[PDB]
Design a protein around this ligand. Structure first.
Ligand SMILES: *[C@@H]1O[C@H](CO)[C@@H](O[C@@H]2O[C@H](CO)[C@@H](O)[C@H](O)[C@H]2NC(C)=O)[C@H](O)[C@H]1NC(C)=O
Ligand SMILES: *[C@@H]1O[C@H](CO)[C@@H](O[C@@H]2O[C@H](CO)[C@@H](O)[C@H](O)[C@H]2NC(C)=O)[C@H](O)[C@H]1NC(C)=O
Ligand SMILES: *[C@@H]1O[C@H](CO)[C@@H](O[C@@H]2O[C@H](CO)[C@@H](O)[C@H](O)[C@H]2NC(C)=O)[C@H](O)[C@H]1NC(C)=O
Ligand SMILES: *[C@@H]1O[C@H](CO)[C@@H](O)[C@H](O)[C@H]1NC(C)=O
Ligand SMILES: *[C@@H]1O[C@H](CO)[C@@H](O)[C@H](O)[C@H]1NC(C)=O
Ligand SMILES: *[C@@H]1O[C@H](CO)[C@@H](O)[C@H](O)[C@H]1NC(C)=O
Ligand SMILES: *[C@@H]1O[C@H](CO)[C@@H](O)[C@H](O)[C@H]1NC(C)=O
Ligand SMILES: *[C@@H]1O[C@H](CO)[C@@H](O)[C@H](O)[C@H]1NC(C)=O
Ligand SMILES: *[C@@H]1O[C@H](CO)[C@@H](O)[C@H](O)[C@H]1NC(C)=O
Ligand SMILES: *[C@@H]1O[C@H](CO)[C@@H](O)[C@H](O)[C@H]1NC(C)=O
Ligand SMILES: *[C@@H]1O[C@H](CO)[C@@H](O)[C@H](O)[C@H]1NC(C)=O
Ligand SMILES: *[C@@H]1O[C@H](CO)[C@@H](O)[C@H](O)[C@H]1NC(C)=O
Ligand SMILES: *[C@@H]1O[C@H](CO)[C@@H](O)[C@H](O)[C@H]1NC(C)=O
Ligand SMILES: *[C@@H]1O[C@H](CO)[C@@H](O)[C@H](O)[C@H]1NC(C)=O
Ligand SMILES: *[C@@H]1O[C@H](CO)[C@@H](O)[C@H](O)[C@H]1NC(C)=O
Ligand SMILES: *[C@@H]1O[C@H](CO)[C@@H](O)[C@H](O)[C@H]1NC(C)=O
Lengths: 367, 396, 204, 99, 50
């Protein structure tokens, strides 16, 4: 706010204007990035008063009216993150962001993927999980026969996440680095006001009070040059950093469209194992996904053969693999051991026994 | 229009200016002034020694009362080699060399610093470079002997052409006997003035030579006894001790922020609203174009439904009770638009219609028809190509 | 004879309040764990400035002399405590081995169970004194504990101090230009420090 | 002259640095458009909301200045009815599930 | 390695530190890129002899 300096700053033309046009480009983009991720839902879905989701217990990630009305886990995520400069508010408040994570979650719980392709269609949650099992090649009878075990494995796994997020902050390092980088950059920009840049003092009122004008203008132009270079260094760094955050916001928007609104078959995209579903939770400066996956866990060895010989015909399985326990032969679904008797209706024919390497002799049953 | 360098404006919000509250007055504080230099210890002794041959010594490490010495008629005359005594009241030296002694006025007229004659050249040695003055009174009142000037020699400041002075006892210091003295040059510095101390207003300030502008406020920091300034993490001064009243004042920035203009395009209307980003509406009618500047500007400062938001003070836009989709964004969930008879309105934006999905453990909904739908998507692929001959851009 | 200086001899470098923060600064400091000379007066060089201390229960130390020679040639600081006040003058004093007790003049001023510590330095012609007082159990060496010396006196007198001596158990160490990281507590006192050169961990 | 050479060179470095950052922003869009053409136009993508909202059928490329436009054909369900449902059926003491 | 030059470079303040910090962050990132591409495997699986 020194006028004698501001008159010299006019000599430099449009530099102290295209800087503001660049930081304005950054500032709008942060609201756009936030809207690409969360605003994928057309209507604010809300959960029923009853909670009979087939034995699954979402109460730790659904909204809590005693909390904004965030979930239990969203409160952990909000707790574990911790000179002419102006910070500006985001367009969406944290109370709006928590309504979008609520709506996405209430849609996914009551209506599966259907709200991502039209109006939300209600479905019983045990039947929704049978569709998620078919999506990974495990036959839907496997869910209903094991539903109370599967519900308890899910309920148990959510409990471990609360304990992990309670016990250490070290998981949220990706979000805490954004906060630390923003603070570190602004402190560095302010610290550089104290530097001389070869001028007789870094305090502008010293120069103006101690020197005659023809000498003072030479000193002030060093401070102008140093401070302008120190501000251009900050703005250039912020443009490079904002492109990294945009590449992450595009990935997060894609993870939400594919993992939450559907069932992605892209390997390791929605966490390790075969993907079942995922749930969004909000956090400071970002988003958290709870990816739910099916992992097979107790293998046995079996003998196998690519085909079977009956009445000269070579038989192949329709949807499964032939296996033996050493004395008998069965056809089995590939992702979970459920042996079935080998019949004309589990199999199909092509040609005779001569061409196939490793074909074996067994009875194929006719119902 | 001048911001965009265009006569036609598309719909949006444009930052056009910065608002910055001005300092209302200036506050100056220095300690309760003490240990003034005893200039009377020179100038009250002016009858004593021989003015062509006396010794002289430094006055130093005590405050130069030259402001009072300029106003006070403490001698029959005074004159200076450097500036006037009012200008000397702003100066300093390691010491001022000084002496007091009487002489015949025909010689003593040469004893003003920078003057002609044998005094300023030798007997009262003081060129025009002497940072100070000489002053005198008629010695015929007491300093002269029964024979006049014969009690002393006549031609440093008032100190060693000297010979026994001939001035007769019947007359004043301009030719007959003068009782006289002189004094001229980090320690002999003039006193620093001070004002009252003002709180809770944007002021310019100076404490002990540390300077700034800000809102001074009462504060609860506990400095150690010898500490005088407080600093924030990023070097920034944020508290001071008043040297007259040893309590601590906090320094806070004078309020400032971006000014943005909210507009439907010039095709739709010339009505606008203005947002003072991060300002509190109480502070707004200050610094830039405000309540004074006619129906062409004061409409956007004084009235037209002034309204307060978490983004800043907003002027010219009507607050509305409904919610709608966000047309022009403002911040913290506020958006604005031009609507029906038509005006600019500001409202909390609407996330979408709310919907209870009719879930129960044995109900399913199945679609009985379809629509084919064609959706457009647009993607950029390539910039305009360019190359620049910097030899020609730089040197022409 | 010599002793380990431990972490003694930090002092507040400026008249500024800072709270709950770590501040990194370069100044003339006593290096941590340096060798400090011990004595029972002998005439010593002043170098870049002196950490001085004594252990007391008797009040037998009464002052110091600083200058080039302090015998009629030129201005020299005589600094004395007489238990009524501290007394200072800068005269061309003339005396024997010292003006010790029975056990021009351009400027003047007025102001084992215990350890008394001081730092004396000259920068820009300002002669500066920092001080501290504490009880002790180690009547034999400097205690292995941390406390920061705080300013007293700050005189614009510009004299070329190059030698000094005590006026009648006491310890001498020399300041060196070093970088320190200083910890300010919630009340703006210095409460810990790192001598940045001391070891690879201190550089870290 | 050295002040003008210094100012004009710094003014050109500022332009070239912003164009290098803007080029990377456009290349990330060109890699996306090249992927939308390979997956949506040359195939039928199962990736939810990649090739337009609704279930994807096909899409058509159209050119535009500095870019490309995709017309995404998609299937959206309509006119639902509520029904009672069950996960399985008991026939002769055995549980049946739909294929 | 001129001392007279180094004392002048201190008056430009924090530029040298943020250059050293930028290239340090660049250097660490190359090891993370190489880890994420190749280290996708939980055990060193080995081929049978036949
Ligand atoms: C869902 O799981 C949560 C725990 O993760 C259950 O909440 C606890 O319930 C017991 C018994 O009412 C209380 O003692 C605990 O204090 C509850 N904990 C919390 C954090 O509220 C909850 O009861 C389960 N709900 C259902 C429907 O199974
Ligand atoms: C391989 O699987 C078959 C069918 O499960 C087993 O054959 C049955 O064995 C039980 C006794 O374990 C008998 O009671 C049944 O009558 C057998 N059924 C038939 C059709 O033979 C067979 O034991 C299994 N082999 C091994 C080594 O466990
Ligand atoms: C599978 O069964 C067929 C007969 O159904 C076996 O083929 C015959 O095997 C005998 C003994 O080697 C020969 O005398 C016949 O000439 C064979 N006939 C044919 C058409 O090849 C066959 O060997 C059995 N396969 C295995 C692996 O045991
Ligand atoms: C399969 O059998 C081999 C020995 O024949 C053994 O090394 C291997 O661990 C077995 N695997 C399982 C899953 O039992
Ligand atoms: C496996 O290899 C053995 C030894 O060469 C061979 O006899 C057998 O037919 C092969 N079986 C299959 C299924 O490849
Ligand atoms: C300054 O002088 C006033 C009286 O004029 C006195 O009340 C006040 O305590 C003094 N303050 C200091 C710091 O000497
Ligand atoms: C804007 O309005 C003017 C008349 O006021 C008209 O001539 C012009 O074509 C309009 N432009 C657009 C883009 O609508
Ligand atoms: C400052 O702004 C708040 C709202 O942020 C308002 O309630 C308050 O009255 C304003 N303060 C003054 C002194 O006008
Ligand atoms: C909006 O409604 C509230 C009551 O909920 C009322 O106090 C307020 O005056 C209304 N404002 C407008 C602009 O209608
Ligand atoms: C299905 O919708 C179309 C319009 O999209 C309508 O013409 C048609 O009659 C509807 N058919 C049925 C069976 O509802
Ligand atoms: C000097 O001090 C160091 C510790 O800093 C010590 O190792 C060394 O022995 C000392 N030298 C003498 C001569 O006492
Ligand atoms: C006394 O001070 C003068 C300068 O003011 C100097 O010439 C002289 O040598 C000094 N004498 C002593 C004894 O310090
Ligand atoms: C101690 O010094 C003071 C001046 O600081 C003086 O008045 C007093 O007489 C001195 N007393 C003794 C015992 O030297
Ligand atoms: C101090 O001594 C140095 C030479 O050692 C000399 O340059 C300087 O002028 C002296 N200053 C005073 C005040 O005697
Ligand atoms: C800070 O100072 C107050 C008195 O001003 C004292 O009561 C408190 O114990 C001190 N706290 C610390 C951390 O030293
Ligand atoms: C489905 O049934 C519920 C009541 O069970 C009703 O509220 C809802 O409107 C019905 N929806 C449709 C599409 O028929």
């Amino acid at each position: 706010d020194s006028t004698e300096c501001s008159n010299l700053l006019l000599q430099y033309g449009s530099f102290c204007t295209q800087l503001n046009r660049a930081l304005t480009g950054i500032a709008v983009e942060q609201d756009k990035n936030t809207q690409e991720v969360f605003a994928q839902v057309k209507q604010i879905y809300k959960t029923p008063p009853i909670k009979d989701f087939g034995g699954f217990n979402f109460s730790q990630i659904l909204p809590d009216p005693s909390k904004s009305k965030r979930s239990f886990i969203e409160d952990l995520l909000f707790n574990k993150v911790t000179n002419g400069l102006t910070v500006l508010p985001p367009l969406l408040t944290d109370e709006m962001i928590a309504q979008y994570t609520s709506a996405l979650l209430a849609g996914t719980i009551t209506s599966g993927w259907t709200f991502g392709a039209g109006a939300a269609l209600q479905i019983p949650f045990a039947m929704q999980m049978a569709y998620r099992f078919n999506g990974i090649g495990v036959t839907q009878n496997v869910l209903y026969e094991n539903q109370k075990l599967i519900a308890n494995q899910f309920n148990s796994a959510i409990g471990k996440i609360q304990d992990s997020l309670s016990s250490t902050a070290s998981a949220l390092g990706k979000l805490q680095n954004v906060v630390n980088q923003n603070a570190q950059a602004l402190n560095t920009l302010v610290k550089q006001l104290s530097s001389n840049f070869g001028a007789i003092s870094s305090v502008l009122n010293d120069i103006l009070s101690r020197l005659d004008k023809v000498e003072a203008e030479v000193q002030i132009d060093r401070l102008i040059t140093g401070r302008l270079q120190s501000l251009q260094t900050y703005v250039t760094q912020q443009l490079i950093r904002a492109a990294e955050i945009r590449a992450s916001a595009n990935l997060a928007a894609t993870k939400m469209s594919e993992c939450v609104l559907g069932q992605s078959k892209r390997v390791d995209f929605c966490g390790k194992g075969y993907h079942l579903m995922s749930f969004p939770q909000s956090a400071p400066h970002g988003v958290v996904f709870l990816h739910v996956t099916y992992v097979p866990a107790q293998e046995k060895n079996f003998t196998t053969a690519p085909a079977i010989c009956h009445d000269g015909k070579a038989h192949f399985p329709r949807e499964g693999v032939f296996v033996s326990n050493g004395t008998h032969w069965f056809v089995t679904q590939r992702n979970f051991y459920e042996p079935q008797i080998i019949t004309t209706d589990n199999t199909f024919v092509s040609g005779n026994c001569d061409v196939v390497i490793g074909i074996v002799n067994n009875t194929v049953y006719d119902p | 229009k001048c911001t965009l360098k265009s006569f036609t404006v598309e719909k949006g919000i444009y930052q056009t200016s910065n608002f910055r509250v001005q300092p209302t007055e200036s506050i100056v504080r220095f300690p309760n002034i003490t240990n003034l230099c005893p200039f009377g210890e020179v100038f009250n002794a002016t009858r004593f020694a021989s003015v062509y041959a006396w010794n002289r010594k430094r006055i130093s490490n005590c405050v130069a009362d030259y402001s009072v010495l300029y106003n006070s008629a403490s001698f029959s005359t005074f004159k200076c080699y450097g500036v006037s005594p009012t200008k000397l009241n702003d100066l300093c030296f390691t010491n001022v060399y000084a002496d007091s002694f009487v002489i015949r006025g025909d010689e003593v007229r040469q004893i003003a610093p920078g003057q002609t004659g044998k005094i300023a050249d030798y007997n009262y040695k003081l060129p025009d470079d002497f940072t100070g003055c000489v002053i005198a009174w008629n010695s015929n009142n007491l300093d002269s002997k029964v024979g006049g000037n014969y009690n002393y020699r006549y031609r440093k400041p008032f100190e060693r052409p000297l010979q026994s002075y001939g001035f007769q006892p019947t007359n004043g210091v301009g030719y007959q006997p003068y009782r006289v003295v002189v004094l001229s040059f980090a320690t002999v510095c003039g006193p620093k003035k001070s004002t009252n101390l003002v709180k809770n207003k944007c002021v310019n300030f100076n404490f002990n030579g540390l300077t700034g502008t800000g809102v001074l406020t009462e504060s609860n920091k506990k400095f150690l006894p010898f500490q005088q300034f407080g600093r924030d993490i990023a070097d920034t001064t944020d508290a001071v001790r008043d040297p007259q009243t040893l309590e601590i004042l906090d320094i806070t920035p004078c309020s400032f922020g971006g000014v943005s203009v909210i507009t439907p395009g010039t095709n739709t209307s010339n009505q606008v609203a203005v947002l003072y980003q991060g300002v509190n509406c109480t502070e707004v009618p200050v610094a830039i174009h405000a309540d004074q500047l006619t129906p062409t500007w004061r409409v956007y400062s004084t009235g037209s439904n002034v309204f307060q938001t978490r983004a800043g003070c907003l002027i010219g836009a009507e607050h509305v009770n409904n919610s709608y989709e966000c047309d022009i964004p403002i911040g913290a969930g506020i958006c604005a638009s031009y609507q029906t008879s038509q005006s600019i309105i500001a409202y909390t934006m609407s996330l979408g219609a709310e919907n209870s999905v009719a879930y129960s453990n044995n109900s399913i909904a199945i679609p009985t028809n379809f629509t084919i739908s064609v959706t457009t998507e647009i993607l950029p692929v390539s910039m305009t190509k360019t190359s620049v001959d910097c030899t020609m851009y730089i040197c022409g | 004879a010599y002793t380990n200086s431990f972490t003694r001899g930090v002092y507040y470098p400026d008249k500024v309040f800072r709270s709950s923060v770590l501040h990194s600064t370069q100044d003339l400091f006593l290096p941590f764990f340096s060798n400090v000379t011990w004595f029972h007066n002998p005439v010593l060089p002043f170098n870049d400035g002196v950490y001085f201390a004594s252990t007391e229960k008797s009040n037998i130390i009464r002052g110091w002399i600083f200058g080039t020679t302090l015998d009629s040639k030129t201005q020299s600081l005589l600094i004395v405590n007489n238990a009524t006040n501290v007394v200072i003058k800068v005269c061309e004093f003339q005396f024997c081995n010292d003006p010790f007790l029975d056990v021009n003049c351009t400027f003047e001023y007025v102001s084992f169970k215990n350890l008394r510590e001081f730092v004396f330095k000259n920068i820009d012609g300002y002669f500066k004194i920092y001080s501290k007082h504490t009880p002790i159990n180690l009547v034999r060496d400097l205690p292995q504990g941390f406390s920061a010396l705080e300013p007293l006196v700050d005189l614009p007198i510009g004299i070329n101090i190059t030698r000094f001596q005590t006026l009648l158990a006491y310890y001498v160490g020399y300041l060196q230009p070093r970088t320190f990281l200083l910890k300010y507590n919630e009340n703006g006192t210095i409460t810990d420090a790192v001598d940045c050169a001391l070891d690879p961990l201190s550089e870290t």
